[PDB]
Amino acid sequence: IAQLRPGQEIDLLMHCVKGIGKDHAKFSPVATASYRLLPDITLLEPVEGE
Amino acid sequence: PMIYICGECHTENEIKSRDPIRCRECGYRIMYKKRTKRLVVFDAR
Amino acid sequence: IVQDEILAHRLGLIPIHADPRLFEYRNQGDEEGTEIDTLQFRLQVRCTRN
Amino acid sequence: MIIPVRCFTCGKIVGNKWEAYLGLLQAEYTEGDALDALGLKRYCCRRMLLAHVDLIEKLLNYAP
Amino acid sequence: SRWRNLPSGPSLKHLTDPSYGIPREQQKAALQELTRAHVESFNYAVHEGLGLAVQAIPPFEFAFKDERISFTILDAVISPPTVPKGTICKEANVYPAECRGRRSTYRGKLTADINWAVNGISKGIIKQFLGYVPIMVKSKLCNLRNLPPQALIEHHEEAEEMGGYFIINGIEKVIRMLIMPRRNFPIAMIRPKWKTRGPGYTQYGVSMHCVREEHSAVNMNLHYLENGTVMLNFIYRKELFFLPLGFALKALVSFSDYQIFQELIKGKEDDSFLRNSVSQMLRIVMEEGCSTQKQVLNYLGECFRVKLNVPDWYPNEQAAEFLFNQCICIHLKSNTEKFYMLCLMTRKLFALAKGECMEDNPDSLVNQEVLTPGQLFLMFLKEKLEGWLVSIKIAFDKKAQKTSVSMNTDNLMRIFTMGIDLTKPFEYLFATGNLRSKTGLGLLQDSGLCVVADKLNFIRYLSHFRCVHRGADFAKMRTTTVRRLLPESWGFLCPVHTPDGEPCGLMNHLTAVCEVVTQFVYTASIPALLCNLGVTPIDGAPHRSYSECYPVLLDGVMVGWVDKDLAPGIADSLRHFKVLREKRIPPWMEVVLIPMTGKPSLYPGLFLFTTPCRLVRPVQNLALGKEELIGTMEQIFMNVAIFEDEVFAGVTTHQELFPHSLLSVIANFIPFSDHNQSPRNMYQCQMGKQTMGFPLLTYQDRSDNKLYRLQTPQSPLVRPSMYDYYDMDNYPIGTNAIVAVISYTGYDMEDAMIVNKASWERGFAHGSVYKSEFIDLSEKIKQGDSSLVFGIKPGDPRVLQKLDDDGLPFIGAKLQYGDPYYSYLNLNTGESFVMYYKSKENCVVDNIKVCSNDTGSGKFKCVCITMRVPRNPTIGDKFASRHGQKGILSRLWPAEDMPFTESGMVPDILFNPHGFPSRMTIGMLIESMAGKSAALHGLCHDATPFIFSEENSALEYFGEMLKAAGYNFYGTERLYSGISGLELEADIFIGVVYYQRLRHMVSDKFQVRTTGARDRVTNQPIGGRNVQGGIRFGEMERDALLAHGTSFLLHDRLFNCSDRSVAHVCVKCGSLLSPLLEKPNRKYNCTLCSRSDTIDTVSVPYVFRYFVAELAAMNIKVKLDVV
Amino acid sequence: VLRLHYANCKAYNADFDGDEMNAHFPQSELGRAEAYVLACTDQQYLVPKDGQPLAGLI
């Protein structure tokens, strides 16, 4: 959160409320949730010999 | 009990009306006001 | 050394393990908050030479 | 100044891999192997640690 | 050397090193050599040059009563800054850390010891205190000299600072190298406005700029008159005086007319117009009355005595010597050498007139040199010391003229009577920048001499100590020929780094390898060595014909006539001495040999410059491999390959150190500048100096005005290796962003850019501004009782809980318009004044410095409050890449509407692909791939220009890097549409590029006015943004609005909004001045005709009534017909 | 920021790279009639230099 040196002090109260990742990213619950279509690969000819 | 930290000595000097603005234990002429505990509210956005 | 607004920002982006389904949304202008909609945490740290 | 808490593009939390990153680099590991051993797969996260400049260590050197 | 240990490719394992924060044992040494010309010049100006300056200083003799008194200044000494008098305690030294906290000048004490005598047998040495002269930061008269980085951190300094600046009121003036013509070298010029100087003058003439020991400069012009005669123009105290040559030549030398003649016809002894014109110069004006050196000196003395202001008891022959010593050829001590130099400048005007030589362009760097901070400082110091002498003895002569016998009792009380002078004059030249001098110092410019050095970034700051200004007068010129970027500034000035508006071509910057000469040497064994080499002294026996011989010059002094078949070998021998450091040839002497053919090429001859203000640059001397230094004029006669395999056998005398030597320090920070078009690299250089970055490490100490800070900077993953030589990661400037080049939104077109909203909410490019306001409360009052003490009378309802009992906000409190901001207390009366915060923006107080009076005796009158203003990227803020692609932020696109890639990623910058086709910034398309490859492999690639050829391409290299990571060669990954969810048909080009955030924000450039203040002379809106202020409509807008036929929109804008009054007129007299009110039925009555039934009100502008009044002022009458 | 359609760019020569622009507010009800009828931005489709269109997509 921070770094301190002798004589330095932090003192605070944080309030946590409910919300959706739409009005601020901090409230978003997933790193990423993407999707991808399944690739399809077809060998039209028998590949061989290096 | 208004405290001011020296510029390089870092001694707490309390200054008032009618008195000069030098620092004790040295003689420097710049002194920073000190942060007291007062409540401030910030938003995390 | 970390500012107050920058500290507030950094604190907003920290994920809390409370499950949001047991809570509720704070009504508009509900600054105080209650057991129903808020969680409070405290950071109080001071650095000293050992 | 200090490590960003969450990667900007994605949001993945990288604010806890700073000291681990520094420790794996002191052990002899390349930045690639090090970023792999921390779980930073996509390059958006890898740039968040690879190119971080810790200037909180240079500000924390002038008098109180 | 000095360019070894230059990194071969950049690294990233220096950050993430176990020793990142430990302050180092010695300072960097590459950053130090940037401000080296500003510091090494001052070091001379203040110690070794000050003694020489005072040594000239002719003893100021004058008459008191029936007595003649002589005052000479034996020494002058400037002392490091220190607490004023001993009235202070515990530390005599004074470090620049303060005077930035307080707002004061870092000034040292200048004191001299004068010696006054009465006829030379009665004498006493008094030591007067002249005044205070400002001091540079690491300048040998400063308290931060010889301090390692660790000890430089306990005084609040940058641990990496190179001062080279002055602190005048805590503002860090940065006096910058101006361009001067040259020193001690005759430049033959063809200027057509010269024939207006007299009846028969021509447009030909050789100018010489003479400098003696860096304390005196003078400009002398030899003009050609149509008769074949040459005139001499000298300037004394800003007045131009014309002396025929011959008067000057006969005075300087006690030689026969034939010997003077045999000298001016040395190389052209067959020409007969010349032989005839020389005789006309010697006889026509000198056999007319004066034929012995003394009679010439006597005649010249009488004509010039009145305007040289010489002593009345001076023989006229002594007043002539005064003119020759102070106005012609200052550089040469002898009068015999001054003769030979005036003779070579004439021998040259005769060749320019007969078209045997080419005019020297004054705008080529070949014939240019720089004016350093020490030359301006000493040249002002010397002039002010002379002025101090003059003023003290003005006071002397004016007081009583009374029996000095007992008056030796108040001699010190007399000298001190005018020793009260030298301090404020000096601060004007530094605080204001403009020069108030009786002689303009042989300068040609009297403003913009010193400028503010602003640390917005460390790339704005480092460019103030490498700037070179052609002149401030050239900003006002129809013709643009001093803005041409000639091929002679190769390696000395950067092609790309020039301001790109009104200052273009006029404000240049030195390349990275270029450097100013600042050392001073003996140069006394050189004239005796040149003779061993083959030169024949000016005295005689050239061994050839004076036409097959080169005229040798060495710093204004003509050694003379090296033979024509010995000149090449002599030049090569002298160049080998300087390279191998043999003899005593300074490592930086410029051995020039301008060959002579039959063509009208530049005047032939072997010059040898060693003066302290020329620009030099390193080049690998082939055939010796010993890293020579060449100058601007010496570089035109030598071949310098850039890459190897460009070196040939006979050709390629030298070779350049690195291929990017030609580019400036900032132009070496642009990645792949070779693949972008040039106007774009000129905008990148100007945009890297307006970037919000990390400006410095010492907050709480600076007390500047504005200071923009970026929260979390990063270091570019693709950067030139020079970025790593001058560690520029101590001060980062931007952030790496995942940019996709896609047309997706409809809001990113025409130069506008899109920013993901979740990236912006996760801290992307957040920033802040620090507004430090110095409240000195000696204002609001004059020299009365102290109305000034910060303080709160107990219980004021106004400051109930916003201040903290010393009339100063709390540290950490938030301020908003209308909030209490300070509270003074007039101590005698006992009344407080809350002084509310009026900015319409929110900030937080982060520190408050209480400052004293410099004697530790101040009384709570001055304070410095620093407010912090959060400036995060809004819509309307300007972003930019490192390739001149600036654009505003038009949208913050939701993070779920962004096109996601097949890897789960989602760009955070959307950049329209239509800025490439017309701007041709192909370096951005390579930086994207290089940065993506870097982020993928954990590497750090270099973007040094000229490292990737046609055979080895950059796209091939980085596409192979990408294809080695599982991505595709061409850098395109295929995205999905975040709005429809379908894989777009085109595969998109995505990558990682380094964005900077510019300092121009809509929050600082937005205005709305409804009603408000008014100019009281015209009664129109005031016209500013800090004041409410209206926007000007304009004549172009008035002429484009009545092309619509809208006469009532014009009536509204120009009449009902700006100014509209009801001035009433007398209808019969038809005059606006005539109606006058009465003494209270208030009837305006016409004064000219006493009727009150004739007055009628008319709706008329207010500037029209002002116009009628100012016309009446001239007796003109405006009679207007009312209907 | 004052947002403007991109068809009206070539008419002003605006380029969205920091391009401050002024907005005036008629106050008479007789200059509004002329701003509506004469100065409107669709009566301005053709440049008066040679009558060729000015507004267009880009």
Place this chain on the structure above:
RNA sequence: UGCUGACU
């Protein structure tokens, strides 16, 4: 009011 920067 002027000189220095700066924006299109």
Place this chain on the structure above:
DNA sequence: TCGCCAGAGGACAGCGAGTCAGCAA
């Protein structure tokens, strides 16, 4: 031999808009 065609230089007056800032006299 001086009026008018020629002939000379000297003087003046113009040099795109509109913005924002700081510093100092």
